[PDB]
Amino acid sequence: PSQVRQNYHQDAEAAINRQINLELYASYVYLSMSCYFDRDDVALKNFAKYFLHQSHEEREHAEKLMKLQNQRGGRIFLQDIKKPDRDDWESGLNAMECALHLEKSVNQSLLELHKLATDKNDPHLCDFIETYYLSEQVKSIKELGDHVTNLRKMGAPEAGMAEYLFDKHTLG
Amino acid sequence: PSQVRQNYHQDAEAAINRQINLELYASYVYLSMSCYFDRDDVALKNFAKYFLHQSHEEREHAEKLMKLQNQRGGRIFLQDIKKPDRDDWESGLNAMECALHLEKSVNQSLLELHKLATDKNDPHLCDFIETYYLSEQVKSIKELGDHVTNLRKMGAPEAGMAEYLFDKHTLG
Amino acid sequence: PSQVRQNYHQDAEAAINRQINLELYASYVYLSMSCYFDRDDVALKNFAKYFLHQSHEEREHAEKLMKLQNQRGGRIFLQDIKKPDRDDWESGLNAMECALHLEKSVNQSLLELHKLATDKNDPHLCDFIETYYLSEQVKSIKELGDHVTNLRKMGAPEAGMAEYLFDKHTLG
Amino acid sequence: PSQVRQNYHQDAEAAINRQINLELYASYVYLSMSCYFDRDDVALKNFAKYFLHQSHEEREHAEKLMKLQNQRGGRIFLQDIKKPDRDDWESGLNAMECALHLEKSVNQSLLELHKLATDKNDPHLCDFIETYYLSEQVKSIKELGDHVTNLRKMGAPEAGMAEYLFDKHTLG
Ligand SMILES: [Fe+3]
Ligand SMILES: [Zn+2]
Ligand SMILES: [Zn+2]
Ligand SMILES: [Zn+2]
Ligand SMILES: [Zn+2]
Prior knowledge:
This is part of a larger assembly, with four copies of chain A.
Chain A: H1 10-37, H2 45-71, H3 92-119, H4 123-154, H5 160-169
Helix pairs in contact in A: 1-2, 1-3, 3-4
Bound molecules: fe (iii) ion and zinc ion (4 copies).
One zinc ion binds near residues 61 and 106 of chain A.
PDB class: metal binding protein
Keywords: Iron storage, metal binding protein
Entry title: Structure of mouse heavy-chain apoferritin determined by cryoEM at 100 keV
């Protein structure tokens, strides 16, 4: 047992390892989306910039959980990062809808983690999740819902100027 | 009778109390509209910002009348602020049309108040209304009429890009 | 159901609507108190300034809950804002005592809301209340208790110079 | 008839001459009060400073009416400035009460003047009075009412420290 370990259940250590994998997976999905919008047959630079920013943010989320695991005296066990479900993301609207789905799935994972920390009476870990993860997920899910709403009303993907003008106005 | 009171008719005191209520009501209507445009299924940030600015302006109008009532030695009697007529304002165009209707109703209230101050030979109160209320209402009614004209010509609400591009160009 | 909604119970949505009404009511009570201290027969400018600051702060509290309701995919349903219990607040000491009573009643409402969010396993909403509401209420209740203590010891309201000198020293 | 005269009734010219005399009289009353508070047996420097400021302000009010009379092509006819009703103003509270009485009497004179300009269809003269005289009188009467309220509550003139502390806090 680590000299620093105190009130850190083996189940919490295991759940934090699963979450690190999921944040690294989310980072890979966003990178896949970023490089789709950089294709010459798609060519939406501000969609590509937006998803690359999200990819980097998710890597910072993963790295902060790795820091937490080490501060609490747990041990990081890394696993394969699975390839994303698509190479071709079809449209700006479809990628925003898939990003929304991914962010809600990551949020559900964190709520299951908070529930585990509550059941194991781990107040430091509960507060860590609330402070740096849950606040930020609610704000992300709302941003993506807003983007989806706006793109559907402008008539994306069938309206050719919808994603062009969204790329300049909302994402530019 | 207040030591400061001079040439302030009890009817004028009563009418200023009714106007305070109407400016506070207008503030509440604008706040209702502001929070409609912040819904994820509407998601027009600059429409929400515009109506929140109007909500704050109307609270400043109410507060200035409360200052007038106290300077003249009248007594403020507050009344319930009634809830707005809708929760769902339907579209950017509909909210602008409802705002236009509300601002004309507030203007008519002030013209009835000016007529009362003229009939009671209250020149200080007449000048107060002209200087800080009537000028400002004419300018508001014209701004809203302009917004409505522009949104109808762009084809709102059926044209999906009309309110999107109005939100960026006119309100951004 | 809203595309952004996740882990937000209908009871929590209803309770947040009741709290918005209570923060708007508190804003109206403070405005009533502010305009009492501006009467020429009361004439305590720094008491009026203090209560107007509180009125504005409570409107910011209400607006932040409206933002929370929209971020979580709930729907704001506004209700009438009831008129305050008095027009005449009697003295500086009495208004501070009534403000203390109001702030404890708002605090009890938030503790009932936290208990509901705990029972519905809503950690984002629990953390929101703790971070932006409960900390701030404890600090307000203590400030008002301090003011009341000081005014009673100086001999308010019977000692004429007590509220005058409190207005200059503590509130100036 | 003056080459510049247009729509200026002989009654309005006469009434403006009477008002010039009253503003010069008010200036003399305030100067009398200022020099009472500078006596070694009264010795309230900030009461003396306050009334000297009012004396100078009233001379500026008189001079602005003299400018108006000349702009409209009337002729200034000056009259004796009568001596004030007292040399000894008794107390800070009594002087503030006498100042309140004087300012209400000047205000009533201006309302009679506005009524005359309204009856003679002189809109330039009506607007002149509203803009530079009536606004300012309401604000003066309210300031003096506030001062009187505060001094009576602190227990002036019998409470020896009331006028001392008012001189430092309110007027300093
Ligand atoms: Fe002192
Ligand atoms: Zn993340
Ligand atoms: Zn208004
Ligand atoms: Zn509050
Ligand atoms: Zn004057």
